[PDB]
């Protein structure tokens, strides 16, 4: 079965294979030092500036996601929406009692920096958040003007990089983030299992909130940070991620970023051949392609022919239920021959 | 480095390897199946009465743990503490606002079911939660004695299971209870960054409380019974936990029970006859053997010193910080080649 869903990802062969080596305790000094690697790696692709916390979650994505909403001490907080992701977001803030303002944005567009710059001028907030790229739809958003924005109305500024982390450039320091995270399984191409997150200086000062045990920041910094025992944490998923990591830089962003860009440019081509019509109306984004099935073609079953064919694809998801077929971009969802294979069992299904 | 810590274990081959399986998604119709064929053992293990909820979390133990707390309706409910892991059920109920009453016992003594039972008739509790083998002091709870006074008083019965599920007789059923809950790497001898649970029919009506969004075991219900979409899961980790809850069953764990049970008895003897002396005053824990060392002996330096030795256990932990050894005897560390080993060890930091 050929994953190309929008997440989870191929793992490399290098990366899997990690998993077998020796187990050991989640305190032992060899683990402690793949740790503190695993916070360097991370430091470079994040760019979180001096002062900030760099860990990775024992859980997924939605883990990560969560931590930088129930460790803040109030809101309001300003959700920018335009997808399933961004609306999770939302839900989030609200269950911890962020008292959450949402700003939404048609599904298939990017959120607007002027609309974000008008209601910034509305209200106070003590934050902002934005999901980079928003998965269900296939847009990306302007993640560094927003936080400029941000930075000038003095709040945080909370961002999901789990479909750009990774695959296209990024840094905190530039685009004035104080919280980005992403999960192990996307654009990483790792095992799923941990979540990648990063705290600024700023974010930690107001990260006094107590809501939850398990993702309580200062206790994920007590082992990070000073080797202290918070839980156990999936020492396996930790020597993996570690490697992928170093896959990641090895190939460097830059390149990997035109790798996504140079696939998502044939596929649409090809599949605007077949019929099929892009979703994001603007500011398409080059790990996930989102296309509308052709004229008469149910896109969930459409989804179920390719596994029958031998391949794994996402149906749309929140507004684009249905709709869509959502194709991964990110991680070694990018290659030639993972997507010519896609296009010979998408013709065998569409024959049918 | 061979793993004696009390968690995590040492992977048996055949599990580890399981972890090189093909990667799929997490809603891939064949992941589908192995999460039930996962519910279906765990349910052999933990026998959770119909209607009882069965996932594997994706996280450590404590967020079995803090699931169990963090989805309750209300309190008060009493916790009985008696070592680090039930402080830290007792941490957790605070933090949600479960207006926790504590009812202390020494550490290195049991509960005593009489006093709970004293307890219960002085004011009427929401829930009674215990930790069944208490890891840091080495003591067996009359786990079954406190359920059936939980059930006479109304209340709920939560118990950490994780140094008794999968190596000692284990019943919820049996022992009245409405929440158990371990981690992958405990007596299942599986890779960390799971967590079984088993919420009983009661249990979940009680759980309408929102206070979490990873940790919502209404959430995770949709996905593990009704393969909806909650979040990416370990997929991996997946395949391990099955191969694992398959090799216990095929061995029973009435062979597990008495192999912990041996090797206990005998590593106490050739312990003591080093002058090392038992920590638990009494009603050991077959699955945890806690001693303190010769006097004069330092636990912590000695802890170092089997490490650079090529053997890992651990130190103390809450009460028992640097004041002990714990060795597993949970899983695969219940094994007379790796006690020999871990003595022979011993002796030669003994020497220096
Ligand atoms: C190990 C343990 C836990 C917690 O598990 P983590 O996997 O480290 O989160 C909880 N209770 C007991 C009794 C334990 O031994
Ligand atoms: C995948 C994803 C997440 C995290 O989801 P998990 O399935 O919990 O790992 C969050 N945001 C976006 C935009 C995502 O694509």
């Given at each position: 079965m050929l994953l190309l869903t929008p997440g989870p990802t191929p793992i490399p062969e290098r990366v899997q294979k990690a998993l077998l080596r020796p187990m050991r305790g989640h305190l032992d000094p060899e683990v402690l030092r793949v740790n503190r690697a695993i916070q360097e790696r991370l430091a470079a692709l994040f760019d979180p500036g001096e002062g900030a916390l760099v860990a990775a979650?024992?859980?997924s994505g939605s883990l990560g996601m969560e931590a930088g909403l129930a460790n803040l001490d109030r809101?309001?907080?300003?959700?920018?929406?335009?997808?399933?992701?961004?609306?999770?977001?939302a839900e989030?803030?609200?269950?911890?009692?962020?008292?959450?303002?949402?700003?939404?944005?048609?599904?298939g567009e990017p959120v607007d920096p002027e609309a974000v710059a008008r209601a910034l001028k509305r209200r106070r907030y003590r934050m902002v958040a934005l999901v980079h790229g928003e998965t269900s739809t296939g847009v990306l958003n302007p993640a560094e003007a927003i936080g400029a924005l941000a930075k000038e109305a003095g709040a945080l500024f909370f961002l999901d990089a789990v479909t750009t982390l990774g695959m296209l450039p990024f840094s905190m320091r530039a685009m004035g983030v104080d919280y980005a995270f992403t999960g192990s399984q996307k654009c990483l191409s790792?095992?799923?299992?941990?979540?990648?997150?990063?705290?600024?200086?700023?974010?930690?000062?107001?990260?006094?909130?107590?809501?939850?045990?398990?993702?309580?920041?200062?206790?994920?910094?007590?082992?990070?940070?000073?080797?202290?025992?918070?839980?156990?944490?999936?020492?396996?998923?930790?020597y993996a991620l570690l490697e992928a990591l170093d896959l990641?830089?090895?190939?460097?962003?830059?390149?990997?970023?035109?790798?996504?860009?140079?696939?998502?440019?044939?596929?649409?081509e090809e599949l605007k051949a077949r019929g099929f019509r892009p979703y994001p109306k603007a500011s398409p984004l080059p790990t996930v392609l989102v296309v509308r099935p052709p004229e008469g073609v149910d896109a969930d079953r459409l989804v179920r022919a390719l596994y029958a064919e031998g391949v794994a694809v996402a149906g749309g998801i929140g507004p684009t239920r249905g709709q869509v077929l959502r194709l991964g971009l990110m991680?070694?969802?990018?290659?030639?021959?993972?997507?010519?294979?896609?296009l010979k069992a998408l013709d065998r299904a569409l024959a049918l």
């Open positions: 979650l024992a859980g809101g309001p907080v300003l959700v920018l929406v335009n997808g399933a992701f961004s609306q999770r977001v989030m803030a609200a269950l911890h009692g962020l008292d959450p303002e949402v700003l939404d944005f048609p599904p790792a095992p799923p299992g941990l979540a990648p997150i990063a705290a600024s200086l700023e974010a930690r000062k107001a990260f006094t909130g107590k809501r939850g045990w398990y993702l309580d920041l200062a206790r994920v910094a007590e082992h990070w940070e000073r080797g202290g025992y918070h839980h156990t944490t999936p020492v396996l998923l930790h990641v830089l090895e190939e460097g962003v830059a390149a990997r970023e035109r790798r996504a860009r140079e696939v998502y440019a044939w596929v649409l991680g070694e969802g990018a290659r030639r021959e993972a997507y010519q294979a896609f």
